[PDB]
Nucleic acid binder design. Sequence first.
RNA 1: GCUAAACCUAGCCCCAAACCCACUCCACCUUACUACCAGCAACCUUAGCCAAACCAUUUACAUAAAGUAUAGGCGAUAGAAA
RNA 2: CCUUCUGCAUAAUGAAUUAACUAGAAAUAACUUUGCAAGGAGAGCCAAAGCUAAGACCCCCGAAACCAGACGAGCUACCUAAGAACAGCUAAGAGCACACCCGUCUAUGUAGCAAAAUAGUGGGAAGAUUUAUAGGUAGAGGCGACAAACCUACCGAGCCUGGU
RNA 3: UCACACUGACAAUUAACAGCCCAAUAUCUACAAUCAACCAACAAGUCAUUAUUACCCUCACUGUCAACCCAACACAGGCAU
Lengths: 236, 111, 95, 98, 46, 243, 109
Amino acid sequence: ANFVSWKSRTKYTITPVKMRKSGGRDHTGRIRVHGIGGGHKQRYRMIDFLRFRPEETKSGPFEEKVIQVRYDPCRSADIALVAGGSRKRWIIATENMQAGDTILNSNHIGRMAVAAREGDAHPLGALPVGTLINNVESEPGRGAQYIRAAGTCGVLLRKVNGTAIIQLPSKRQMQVLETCVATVGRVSNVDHNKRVIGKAGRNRWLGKRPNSGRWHRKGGWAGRKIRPLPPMKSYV
Amino acid sequence: ARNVVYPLYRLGGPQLRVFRTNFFIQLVRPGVAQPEDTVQFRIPMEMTRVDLRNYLEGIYNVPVAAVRTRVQHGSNKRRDHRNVRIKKPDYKVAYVQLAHGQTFTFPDLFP
Amino acid sequence: TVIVERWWKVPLAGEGRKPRLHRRHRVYKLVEDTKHRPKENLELILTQSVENVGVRGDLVSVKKSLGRNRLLPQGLAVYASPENKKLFEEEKLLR
Amino acid sequence: YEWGVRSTRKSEPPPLDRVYEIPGLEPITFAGKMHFVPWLARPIFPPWDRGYKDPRFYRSPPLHEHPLYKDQACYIFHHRCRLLEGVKQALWLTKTKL
Amino acid sequence: KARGNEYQPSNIKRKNKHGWVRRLSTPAGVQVILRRMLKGRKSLSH
Amino acid sequence: PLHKYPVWLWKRLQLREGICSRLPGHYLRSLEEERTPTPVHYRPHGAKFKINPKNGQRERVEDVPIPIYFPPESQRGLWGGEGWILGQIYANNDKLSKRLKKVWKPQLFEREFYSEILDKKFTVTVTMRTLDLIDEAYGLDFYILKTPKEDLCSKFGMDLKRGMLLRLARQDPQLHPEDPERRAAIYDKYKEFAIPEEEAEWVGLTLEEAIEKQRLLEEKDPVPLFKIYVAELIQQLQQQALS
Amino acid sequence: ADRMSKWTSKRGPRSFRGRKGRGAKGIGFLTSGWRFVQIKEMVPEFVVPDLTGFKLKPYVSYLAPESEETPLTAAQLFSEAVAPAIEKDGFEPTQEGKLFQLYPRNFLR
RNA sequence: GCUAAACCUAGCCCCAAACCCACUCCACCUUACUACCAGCAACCUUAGCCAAACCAUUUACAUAAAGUAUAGGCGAUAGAAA
RNA sequence: CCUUCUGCAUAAUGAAUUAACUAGAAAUAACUUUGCAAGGAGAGCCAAAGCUAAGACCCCCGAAACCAGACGAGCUACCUAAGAACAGCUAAGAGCACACCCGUCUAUGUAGCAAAAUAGUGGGAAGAUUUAUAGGUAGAGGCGACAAACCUACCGAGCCUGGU
RNA sequence: UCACACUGACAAUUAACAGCCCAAUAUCUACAAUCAACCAACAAGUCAUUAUUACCCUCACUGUCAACCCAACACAGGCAU
Ligand SMILES: [Mg+2]
Ligand SMILES: [Mg+2]
Ligand SMILES: [Mg+2]
Ligand SMILES: [Mg+2]
Ligand SMILES: [Mg+2]
Ligand SMILES: [Mg+2]
Ligand SMILES: [Mg+2]
Ligand SMILES: [Mg+2]
Ligand SMILES: [Mg+2]
Ligand SMILES: [Mg+2]
Ligand SMILES: [Mg+2]
Ligand SMILES: [Mg+2]
Ligand SMILES: [Mg+2]
Ligand SMILES: [Mg+2]
Ligand SMILES: [Mg+2]
Ligand SMILES: [Mg+2]
Ligand SMILES: [Mg+2]
Ligand SMILES: [Mg+2]
Ligand SMILES: [Mg+2]
C-alpha cells in the first residue's frame, strides 16, 4: 500500500510543482470518491492565499504590482502572479486586473471608509457598507478560504461591534472578525458557468471519469426541499 | 585470497598485503585461433583483473600489459536417473596479452 | 471496574486444578457496576483553613473529586491514616 | 497556510519508555545486543561523530560557523538571474543612460 | 481470443511479489517459509 | 513416538536448563509462585458452601476468575485490576433470543500524582478503581509497595515499585542536601518491606529482562591464557623453591 | 521460471544483471557520471619473496622417517618460549594501536 | 515362445526407556546465497460443519464415585466435585 | 448378470480382460455352557436365585458449501510516474485508407494447428485510442462508460491448509 | 536408433553497447511542444543553478552463443522499439 502524497514542499516555491494525480485513491488503495481519474497532466503552482504577510524585516503596509495573468488548471478561476518588494507570490486574480496594475496591501483599520479599488485589500473595518468581496478568512491570520472560485463574490451586510457579517455567495450569513483581511471585487474568469463543454473529450481531459451504470432508484431525498436560510454561524 | 574475509579500508589505512595465496589459475589452448601474443587463463570466481595482473607480475614475472576477462556458463542440460539437472562449475576466462612482442606459442604435449 | 456475572455455571474442577472454560461460559451478564452507585465521602485531615469546609486540624468528609484535585495534590490535606492521626492528636493536645 | 504536510515530513519518533522517568536506576535496554529487539526498553544512544574526515561522506558546518560569514546580505548576480522588470532594472542598478 | 497464455514472464515482478524480503516483511511469508521448511522443500522462495 | 516430558513443562525445562538456571532464587521463586489475584469483574463467594436453593442440601462452590485481557495501554499505565472483558450477552437477557458478543472497556482518565520516595510528578492514565484503591491504601507509594505483582497487572507500576525498593535499600540522596531530617522522616515512614538491594534489583523484571541482566552481569572479556600460564609458572617456581 | 537454478548474474534483466554480480570483491567506488576510481590501497598486493637459493622442493623423498603428530597449541608454544620467563626469576595487553592485530582480522591470510 | 508374473533389502508403523539437532572455507534479510555508510515493526472471545429429521438455545476437541447431583425452545446433548 | 422395481437381453443403472487393494466395527437388554451360591465378583457393583464371563447384531464411494489463515492486478477492470505508436489522399473528439486495437457474417473443426484457430467480407486508426516498465485497489471483498460482467483456462462470487 | 535437433568430452561470448552513481549548509526553476520564425489556441504543459566547506586515490563488476519467449509439443495462437 505504497501511497506518498506529492504535497512535499516546505519552502514556498514559485515554479510549477509536479502534481501527481490520485484518481480517487487513498493511502490504502481503495476508491472512496467516484468520478476522478484519467486526465491530462498538470503542474500545481503554490498559491499564496494569505494576502497580508510582510516580508523579512518588514511590518508596515507595502504596495504591489501585476506582471501577468495566467490560467490555473487546478481550479476554475485564473491566477495572476504579483511581485511585492524583494519577492514574488502567486495569488488569485480579480476581475478587470490587467498587467501592470497597482495593488495596495494594508492592515490599518482607518477611522472612516477607504475607497478600495478592484484589486487591493483592506480589513473589513475600513470597507464601505455593501461591497462585493472575496477570499474571506475564517480567523485573524488564518488564510483565505471562503469565496475563491470564478465569479463568486460576497457582499458586505453590516458591522456589529468588532465583528462583521459577510453574505456568502450561497445566501448564507457568516460573522467574521473585523481585524481579518479580505480582498474586494469579484474573482476573474467571468462567464464560466456558461462555458459549454461540447463533448466528453474535454470532460475526460479535466479528469472526471463517467458516472456509474447502476440505475439508482430515486428515494425520498430526490424530491425538492424548499428549506429556509440557515442560522448565522459566527467564529467568536 | 579466495573465501577469506577482506579488511575494511577506511581512508588512512595501510596497503592491503596478501600473504599465502589461496586461489589458483591454469592456462589452456585457444580453440578459436587467437593472435600471436594473447594467453588464455581460467580465472576463478573470486578474482578480478588487476588482482590476476599483480599475481602474475609477482610470481611468474610475465610482462603483463592488457587483460580482458569474462564469465563462462557451464552447460546444465544433463539429467540423471532421478531427472535432476547437473549444473557444471562456472569458471571465469581471461585473455592476457604479453608486451615487448614476446610471442608465446602454445607447446604441444603428449607427442 | 464493571461487576459482571457468568452464565451456565461452572462444573467445578477439583481443588488444585484449573477449570477448562468454554464459549458457553464466555457469555457473561452485567449485574452491577462501580458507577451509578451512591458515592462515598472519604475522610481527609486538612492542614490549613480553606473556606468553611474544614478547620485546621479538624477532619471532615470532603468529596472525592475536590479531595483529589485541590486538597491532596496541593498538600492541603492528608489521608485518614492511623500514622498521622496520633501526631495530629498530640499536636491538638499540645495546643 | 503552513506548507509541509505531516505525512511528508519526518515521522515523529515514538514516545520514550516510561522506565527512564524513574530517578534513577539502570533501565535494562537492548544495548548489550547488536540488533533490534521488540521486548525490553529502548536506549538513548549518544550523537556519534566520525573521527577522520571522508571526502565521500563529509558533512559541512551550519551557516552560523564560517570563515567570512557577514551580516550584510549581499545580492549576487549570475547568468541564471532572470530579471523581472527588464532594462530599467539594469539601468537603475548600473546608473547609466540608455 | 487465445486465453491459453495467462503467464507473462518477468523477473522483476516475480522477485517483488514472491520475494524473500517481501515474505519476511510480514508474518505471512514467515509462516509460509516455516511451513515449506517443515515440509522439506528444496526451494523456499523465488 | 511420545514425548519424555509434557507440553506444559517445556517452560520449566528451559528455565532449569542453562542461562535461566544461573538466575537468582528469589526471582525464580516469585516467577514460579503464580498466585490467584483479587476478584474484580465478579463478586466472590463468602464461604465454600452456600446451600443451593430448590434442594435443601449443601454443595461446595468456587469462584472462577475472568480470563480478562491486558492491552499495551494497561501495561504502559497504572491500572488497578480491571481490563478488557471480551464476553457475550443475549438480546433481552434471555437465552431464547439471539447470542451476540461484547467487548467491555474500562474508564480511563489522566490525573497527576506525587511520590515522596522518588520526588517526581507523573502523568499516568489512572482509572476509578485505581484511585479508589490508592485512597484506601493512603498514599500512592504505600499502594504500590503493598500490591504484589500479579494483582498489579502492569509494567510501569512494577518498575516504579522496583525503583522505590532500590531507593529504600541504597538510601541514596533523594532530596539533595539541605534536607536531612525530611529525608530521614520519609525513609522511616516506610520502615516496612525494606527489601535488600541484591533482591530489589530483580523485582518486576520479565524473563527476557532477567536473561539480559544475567548476560550483562557475567559478561566481561575472556582472560588471556598467557596470564594463566604465567601464574602456573610462578606457582611451579614457588613449589620448587619450597622443596 | 525454475526454482532450483541458483540465482546468479544470468537471470535478471539489464538492471538486475548490472547491480548483481559474482563474489569477486570490489576494488574501489563509483562517483560522478559513471567514473569508477581505483584505490591502490584496496588493490591486493601479493608479497612474493625471492626463491633464489631455496633448497626445498614441493615433493618429499621416501627415505624420510615417520614421526607422530604433535598438535601445536598455546601450552607448547609457551613451554618452548620459556627461557626468558625463567631467566627473569614480551606481552601486549591492548593491541588497538597495532598494525597486525590478532583478534580483529585486519590482515589477509 | 514373444510380450509378460516369482523372488528381501531398503524402509516403515505400534510401544518401553531417555528430554533431541543446530560454526570445513565464505554469503544469508537489498533482487537470501550480494564485503564496504545517517531510522514505524507482536502482546485481540476462534469460527463453522454436524446433531436436535429444519434451526434461530445448545453441541466434547489409573479405576470407582457416575453417567449421580445439575444445565438444557428442561431435548437433542453436556457434565463434575466431596 | 446386479437392482431401483407388481416387472428387464429388453430399446432401464453399471461393465474389454488379468493383477492386487476395496466395502458391517461398539451399547442397554437377551442366547450361552463354564466357577460359586443367599451370596456373587481381585475394594467400588448386583441381589424375593443371582453374580462373574468367552462367543454373537450394527459398511464403502458419491454433492451443492461456509468458517480463520496465507496468493493473487505478470491475462482481465480501475488508478499512479516516466516513454513509444499512428504512411498517404481530400480538408472539426472531419472522411477514406498503411502499420496497429476490436471481431457483425460466410465455410472448415469441435480430441481441431488452437481447452476459442484459419481466408475474405468488417468498425476505429490525431484520440474518451493502442502499447513497453514498475507500483497500488482481493472474497463478510476489489473493480465496473452496469456485462450483477471480470479478479491466472469452470466466479450469482477462486484457489490450498484444518474443521471434510 | 519420414529418415540420419539423442548421449559422454571439447570452448566460444572478452566492452568501448546499458547499467553498477553523484557529500553536505541554505537560495534561485512564470513567458510550452507542435521545422517555432507569422497566425492560431486549450487538454495550461516532458529536460536548467548559486557562495562556501572537503576532495587532484582513476578504467574494476554484470550479458555479450544459438534455430531462443509465453500456450502440455518442433503448435496456422500473442509480442514493443
Ligand atoms: Mg450525471
Ligand atoms: Mg443511469
Ligand atoms: Mg476427584
Ligand atoms: Mg441438523
Ligand atoms: Mg453381486
Ligand atoms: Mg417403472
Ligand atoms: Mg439388443
Ligand atoms: Mg440393457
Ligand atoms: Mg439408477
Ligand atoms: Mg435411471
Ligand atoms: Mg455403456
Ligand atoms: Mg454465503
Ligand atoms: Mg495492471
Ligand atoms: Mg476521426
Ligand atoms: Mg474511419
Ligand atoms: Mg441491467
Ligand atoms: Mg466430501
Ligand atoms: Mg547477439
Ligand atoms: Mg494450449
